[PDB]
Amino acid sequence: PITGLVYDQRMMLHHNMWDSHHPELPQRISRIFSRHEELRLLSRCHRIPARLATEEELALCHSSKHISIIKSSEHMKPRDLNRLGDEYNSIFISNESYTCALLAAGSCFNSAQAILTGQVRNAVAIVRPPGHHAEKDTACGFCFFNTAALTARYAQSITRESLRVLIVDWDVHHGNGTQHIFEEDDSVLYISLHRYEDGAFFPNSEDANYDKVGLGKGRGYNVNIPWNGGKMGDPEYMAAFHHLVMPIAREFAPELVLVSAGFDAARGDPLGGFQVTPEGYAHLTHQLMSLAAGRVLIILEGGYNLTSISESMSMCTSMLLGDSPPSLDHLTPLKTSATVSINNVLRAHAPFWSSLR
Ligand SMILES: CCS(=O)(=O)N(Cc1ccc(C(=O)NO)cc1)Cc1cccnc1
Ligand SMILES: [K+]
Ligand SMILES: [Zn+2]
Numbered sequence: 001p002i003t004g005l006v007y008d009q010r011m012m013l014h015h016n017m018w019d020s021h022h023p024e025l026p027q028r029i030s031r032i033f034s035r036h037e038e039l040r041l042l043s044r045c046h047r048i049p050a051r052l053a054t055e056e057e058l059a060l061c062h063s064s065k066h067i068s069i070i071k072s073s074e075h076m077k078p079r080d081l082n083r084l085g086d087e088y089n090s091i092f093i094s095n096e097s098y099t100c101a102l103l104a105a106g107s108c109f110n111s112a113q114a115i116l117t118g119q120v121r122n123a124v125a126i127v128r129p130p131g132h133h134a135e136k137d138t139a140c141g142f143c144f145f146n147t148a149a150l151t152a153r154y155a156q157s158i159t160r161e162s163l164r165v166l167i168v169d170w171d172v173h174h175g176n177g178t179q180h181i182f183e184e185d186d187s188v189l190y191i192s193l194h195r196y197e198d199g200a201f202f203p204n205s206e207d208a209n210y211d212k213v214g215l216g217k218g219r220g221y222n223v224n225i226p227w228n229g230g231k232m233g234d235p236e237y238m239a240a241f242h243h244l245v246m247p248i249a250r251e252f253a254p255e256l257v258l259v260s261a262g263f264d265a266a267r268g269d270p271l272g273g274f275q276v277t278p279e280g281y282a283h284l285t286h287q288l289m290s291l292a293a294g295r296v297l298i299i300l301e302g303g304y305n306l307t308s309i310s311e312s313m314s315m316c317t318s319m320l321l322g323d324s325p326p327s328l329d330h331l332t333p334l335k336t337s338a339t340v341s342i343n344n345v346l347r348a349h350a351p352f353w354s355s356l357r
Helices: 009-013 027-038 064-075 078-086 097-116 147-158 176-181 234-252 278-288 306-320 336-349
Strands: 003-006 122-125 165-169 188-195 222-227 256-261 296-300
Touching: 003 097, 003 306, 009 027, 009 097, 027 296, 027 306, 064 078, 064 097, 097 122, 097 147, 097 256, 097 296, 122 306, 147 165, 147 176, 147 256, 147 296, 165 234, 176 188, 188 234, 222 234, 222 336, 234 278, 234 336, 256 278, 278 296, 278 306, 296 306
Parallel strands: 003 122, 122 296, 165 188, 165 256, 188 222, 256 296
Antiparallel strands: none
16 A cells, blocks of 8 residues: 655745744644654655645635635735735735645645545645635635645545545644535535534634534534533543544445544644644544545644644554554543533434444
């Protein structure tokens, strides 16, 4: 089996010109890449090139107005970019932001194509800016275009429209954009684990609660696993995978798995407040590799401790390459609020997934 890897240093050009210490740093991707080389993982992978997404590809998920506005930012002066970014929730923009967002998406299209033709078995995409908060018609939370959602639609476009795509979103934040894009879709199963705190954690919406199961033909195809009242870690994530993610995923029987792989639930993150370990992420990756005949694409989302994200994402690639999972620590009993969350999701989704009964 061959593992693909995409990284292009041009995606570093998107930057915050007023606050050079803003956490969504250019060096997030160069640090992950460096750790892959330092652990000798890079040379074991097959390099996949980045490319620009086209505007037609962006239109698979985004409105023409939103595409045009972000495109127009390429020609603006700093004062105007500061004002434009401030129109969104948690966005900074530089003159390279649009192109970097296009490269992030195109990188993932090339990776999905390589997976779907068998050029590689699985792949990792070391990309920024992230995607999962981006909506059809707007940017949000450091995200301009929804890379994972676009990759699902691109995959369908080169195979068949009903190709079953599973998106597992383990970034500590709810992927509101991904949920909304696919909310009425039964061809793309969206499963998110996220810190929720009864709607008080970013992005601050009850859309992230366990009772949002999808709409229309998509009822049952949106699975929110929301965490409340606890510093969750490996025990809680392993339990969620055993009781919810894996049984639902196996019943769905995806033909492609995309991971919205934020590393902001990691131990050490300055924002997530959680303690998932690098070995925990390795175990989650290894479990997902049992789906879709191994056709897994891991897409970087958030994650802001450079050391944490570099170790964590490298351990995921080690798993894609076929290495044996590192040993987890002794798993403490689940925090009681985590058991409540799991039970709530189980009861909300048992009507749709007989494997949960
Ligand atoms: C000073 C504002 S903020 O930086 O703290 N922030 C903006 C932000 C947006 C998206 C991501 C991310 O990773 N999405 O996947 C992270 C941060 C809000 C925030 C605060 C606490 C916990 N989370 C988020
Ligand atoms: K869906
Ligand atoms: Zn996040």
